[PDB]
Assembly symmetry: none
Homo-oligomer: 46 residues x 8
């Protein structure tokens, strides 16, 4: 039982790892999901 | 397509803890989990 | 040279040891990696 | 962040064996390895 | 007595491989196993 | 589980020296101790 | 002539330490070595 | 280079292990060498 939205979340991270090719995958995870959270807050405020 | 080295392990480590801890928000937990992970990594490297 | 995915795997186990503070590291390893494999299978079953 | 007594030793023991044995799957090998290790510890305790 | 941190784990690691690999000589295998362990450690520290 | 003959003695000998000498690094000392044990054994087998 | 399991390993451990510590009295050192060895075994058992 | 007297010391312990078949080799070592030391003291008086 995979919770709703988990695979989409991981695919968004993945498509960007593939495009941006950041050297550190762990650093990029922190940076990417921080930006995602901010994008969501912008969407929710709008 | 080539998934880069270590990506699949990273996603699966996050996934096991989503299933174990059942967080109320997946994005918040993503920021939390990977921050603690990066810090765990620093701990190991300074050991 | 270390195989791809090895350090990521160890770091995921390490981050949980630090958070969960298990009484026994070996018991936790068995539990942890067993659940990780189950999470992997779940992911693969989903799609 | 203090690495618990014994942790690095466990990780290094698993790692030296990945390097020796070149398992086809690291997760399967982690399950198998730490299971055997617990069985070894049990024998040493008896 | 006061067993230092990591000793039991070290010995269990060696032990699990003695049981697995059934080496004909335990002493030879000890030198062999701990030398490889040390080199694995160097490898892990270099990766970072 | 079947522990092979001589293993637990091997581990206890390493252990009594860890407790006595308090080496800075367990793995480094394991290499040194078991290398030296091998030499001692070679000595005993040549005196024969 | 069968040597019991563990005997040569015992003797070699005492011998390596004679070579390390150069006791001038072999018998005094044996009493101390095997008394310390028993203590060490007791430590491993209560851990 | 094995120091003088070491091998005959181990052989004396070994002959008694084979004969007495002690249940614990370490205990017997403490016992055997403590007794050997008492015997030596005896001989020196």
């Amino acid at each position: 039982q995979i919770p709703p939205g988990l695979t989409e979340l991981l695919q968004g991270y993945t498509v960007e790892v593939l495009r941006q090719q950041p050297p550190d995958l762990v650093d990029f995870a922190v940076e990417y999901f921080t930006r995602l959270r901010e994008a969501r807050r912008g969407l929710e405020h709008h």
